[PDB]
Recover the amino acids of this structure.
C-alpha cells in the first residue's frame, strides 16, 4: 500500500517531464524544418541579388 | 527565354510543394517512430504485470 | 524547488537566447546600416560635386 | 539561356528522385501507424487483464 | 517484488525522459540560435538588395 | 540533479552580464553613428544644393 502511494509520486514527476519533453520534441522537429525553409529563402535572395 | 522561364516555374514550384510535403511526412515518421517505442514500452510494462 | 528552479533556469535560457539572437540581428543591422548610409550618401555627394 | 538550360536538366531529375523517396517513406509510415494504434488498444486491454 | 521493479521502472522513466529532454534542450538551444543567425543573414541580402 | 541545475544556471548568469553590456553598446553605437553620419551628410548635401 505504501509502495503504491510512493510509486504514484514517480508518475507525477514523469508527467511533468513528458510535457516538457513532448513540447521540446515538437519544437525541435519544427525548428529543423525552419532551417530548410530559411536556407531556401537565402538561395533565392542570393541568386537574385 | 520567357517561354523556357515559365516552364521552369511550373516545375520549380511543383518540386517545392512535393519537397515540403516530404519534409512534413519525414518529420511525422520520426515522431511516430520515437512515439512507437513509448507505446511498446508502456504496453510492455502493463503486459509484464 | 527543483521544478521551480528549472523554471527559473529555463526562463533564463529563453532570456539569454533572446539576447544572443538580438546580438546577431544587431550586428547585422549595424553592418547593413553603415553600408546603406555610406553608399547612398557617397554616390549622392559625387553627383553634387 | 545557357544557365537556364542547365538548371532544367538538374531540376527534372531531382523531382523524380524525391518522388520515389516519398513513396517508400510513406509505406513504412503506414505500417508504423497501424502498429501505434494497435499498441494503444492493446495497452488499454492489458490494463484490464 | 514487482513493486520494487515497478517503482524503479517509474524512476527510470524520469531519468530517460530527462536525458532526452536535456539532450533536446541543449540541441534546441544551438538549433534555435542558428535560426536567429540564419534569419539575420536574410536581412543582409534584403538590405543589400 | 539540483546542484547541476543551479550550477548550470549560475554559470550562465555571468555570461548574461557580458551579453547585456554588448547589447547596450551595439544599440548606442548604431543609433549614434546613424544619427551622426546622417546628420552630417544631410547638412553637407543641403549646403551643396
Amino acid at each position: 500500500t505504501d509502495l503504491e502511494e510512493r510509486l504514484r509520486r514517480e508518475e507525477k514527476q514523469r508527467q511533468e517531464l513528458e510535457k516538457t519533453r513532448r513540447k521540446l520534441e515538437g519544437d525541435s522537429t519544427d525548428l529543423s524544418d525552419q532551417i530548410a525553409e530559411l536556407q531556401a529563402q537565402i538561395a533565392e535572395l542570393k541568386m537574385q541579388l | 527565354r520567357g517561354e523556357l522561364a515559365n516552364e521552369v516555374k511550373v516545375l520549380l514550384q511543383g518540386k517545392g510543394d512535393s519537397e515540403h510535403k516530404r519534409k512534413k511526412v519525414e518529420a511525422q515518421l520520426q515522431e511516430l517512430q520515437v512515439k512507437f517505442n513509448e507505446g511498446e514500452r508502456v504496453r510492455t510494462e502493463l503486459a509484464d504485470k | 524547488d527543483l521544478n521551480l528552479e528549472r523554471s527559473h533556469a529555463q526562463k533564463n535560457e529563453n532570456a539569454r537566447q533572446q539576447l544572443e539572437r538580438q546580438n546577431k540581428e544587431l550586428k547585422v543591422k549595424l553592418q547593413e546600416m553603415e553600408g546603406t548610409v555610406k553608399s547612398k550618401y557617397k554616390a549622392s555627394i559625387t553627383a553634387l560635386e
Chain D has one helix and no strands. The two ends of chain D are 72 Å apart (CA to CA).
